Design a protein around this ligand. Sequence first.
Ligand SMILES: CC1(C)O[C@@H]2[C@H](O1)[C@@H](Cn1cc(CCCCC[C@@H]3SC[C@@H]4NC(=O)N[C@@H]43)nn1)O[C@H]2n1cnc2c(N)ncnc21
Ligand SMILES: CC1(C)O[C@@H]2[C@H](O1)[C@@H](Cn1cc(CCCCC[C@@H]3SC[C@@H]4NC(=O)N[C@@H]43)nn1)O[C@H]2n1cnc2c(N)ncnc21
Lengths: 322, 322
Amino acid sequence: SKYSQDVLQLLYKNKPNYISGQSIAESLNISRTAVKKVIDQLKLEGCKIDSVNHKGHLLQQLPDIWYQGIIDQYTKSSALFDFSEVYDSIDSTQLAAKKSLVGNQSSFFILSDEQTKGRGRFNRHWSSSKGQGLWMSVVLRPNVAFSMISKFNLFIALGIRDAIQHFSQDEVKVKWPNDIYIDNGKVCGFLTEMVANNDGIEAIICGIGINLTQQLENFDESIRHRATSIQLHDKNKLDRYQFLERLLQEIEKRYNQFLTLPFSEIREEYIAASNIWNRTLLFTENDKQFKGQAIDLDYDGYLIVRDEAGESHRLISADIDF
Amino acid sequence: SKYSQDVLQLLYKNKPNYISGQSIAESLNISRTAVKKVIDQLKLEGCKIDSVNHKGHLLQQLPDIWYQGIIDQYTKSSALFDFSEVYDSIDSTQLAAKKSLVGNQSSFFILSDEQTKGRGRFNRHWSSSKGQGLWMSVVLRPNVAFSMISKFNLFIALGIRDAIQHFSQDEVKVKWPNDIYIDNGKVCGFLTEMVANNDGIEAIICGIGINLTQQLENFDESIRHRATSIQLHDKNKLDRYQFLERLLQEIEKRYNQFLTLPFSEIREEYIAASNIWNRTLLFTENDKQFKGQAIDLDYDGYLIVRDEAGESHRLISADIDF
Ligand SMILES: CC1(C)O[C@@H]2[C@H](O1)[C@@H](Cn1cc(CCCCC[C@@H]3SC[C@@H]4NC(=O)N[C@@H]43)nn1)O[C@H]2n1cnc2c(N)ncnc21
Ligand SMILES: CC1(C)O[C@@H]2[C@H](O1)[C@@H](Cn1cc(CCCCC[C@@H]3SC[C@@H]4NC(=O)N[C@@H]43)nn1)O[C@H]2n1cnc2c(N)ncnc21
């Protein structure tokens, strides 16, 4: 109902204590019996709320659905982010962010449980299953020249990798410049875009898709052999909210480093986290394709590639298959 | 009415011949007497339409108002532009374009007779009086790296300058990298922004404001001594549509050169059109300000400045006062 979110928010705010129907009823100035029905509704949706006579209700576990009410709590207590928008289903969080950023200087993120028209790089299809991953776009407002986009994209990589890492028992790796892998599985794709002019960046929009809970069974058959979810490498249930909390924390951390450090400072780390070394890489550039090795990431984020013909290239970007 | 535009369009399409009320009435399948009223309306709005018994109506001269109906004709017959949007008044054509470009690959422009929140560079106020200038934003779709924005901005300068030139008896000059002057008067401001990522440009949005018909009397008093309209340097009435036609033609011309030439090819021309030479220039950069001379524009669009302290700078952009 009109108050589902408000109740949820109250439940979350009051953890680890119980609050009474009465008490919520007074908060929202609605009837006790309306609260009982809104709670029955949340339980039905898959909220695990323990209800005890006299004591009240304790939110124990949220389902794999994003609730604005709860996310409102993450923006309230955050320094970086002014607000968020949360959807059950949308064409793409990236389109939404590009639209919402116009005309303001807010920093915000957009979450949606599903995307019907999720796109990655080169307008390639990104699979966004209802309930199974974090499909998000982050808009930030770094006061910097437009050529700093590349640098943004390297720092953020490590933010995302650290967040996924905390939750997988297996080894998590960055595939420069835009993917996160767990062994052979792509567990995350991200894409950093900007609105900018000669004088600087108007906004960074970083779209980030991370598979949380798919079983291989759930991945379209063409991608199954190279995809993975965070769940498939975690012994415990993966809690999307718990993960979202770590992710925002690392995004913020790397954003501050982005703002205050040159790339050289994280280069080694980025290196030791990358999974593109000692192996043949396939490169696409328009029509052409060629094989190559990654020799090094220079102090400026460019990949140094020695191609199959023996020639060296220094690239700011590429699409690499393995 | 519902059909104002349709009638206007028909009037325009049929020039230099007359068409009858009857004939329009059949085109739109509406009544003759409705046509007579829609025509009376257009006349009232300031359309100069000659009406002769038996013969019909001839559109002779449009007022200083943009009509979608007529602009629809400019996009129909154009190779570059998929559509346009036309408004009487809007916050900013630039905000509108940034919003309309999301989710498609259309090329289009937006015209509005007035802007209530017109912005230039650094979010500085741009004065957009109803009826007095061309306030436009152009969205194009060049398939190129994001660093090519600067180059875009130089080519387009010359497009705009050539279009204004054709109409002023006086000498029209580019003030690198974003202004067009007639002697001491800023006659146009433009601003080239982009949506882009590491892989390239998603869209160029070029906002372009050109003063057409202000008398000095009409300019807010702070800018009066350094502003000007195209009218104030044209012996003939300045026809906004006639000008819009030249402007689109030159935008297209320079866009094709942008796509196919390096900067070196237009450099000399850009040079001989620039008005920043042999004079002291004031530069702002964040907090700092300093004086300097423009020595040269290198083959890559960067300004070579020797500052007042004798030091050389190579800049991709700057804000210069005189
Ligand atoms: C043949 C292969 C290897 O299989 C596909 C495809 O090639 C490749 C195409 N591509 C371009 C990019 C760049 C990163 C995109 C970020 C998406 C986020 S979601 C929130 C935000 N909203 C939005 O619209 N976009 C962002 N990544 N992938 O990915 C694989 N692929 C597609 N879906 C998935 C998936 N769910 N999991 C793993 N791999 C996938
Ligand atoms: C003190 C001084 C010198 O007086 C002001 C101010 O400093 C300076 C501030 N600025 C930043 C930029 C960059 C170019 C802007 C392009 C506008 C187009 S309109 C269609 C599109 N929609 C949109 O929102 N923007 C674009 N130019 N000027 O301009 C002067 N100024 C303001 N208005 C005018 C004017 N009408 N005519 C001449 N000078 C003006």
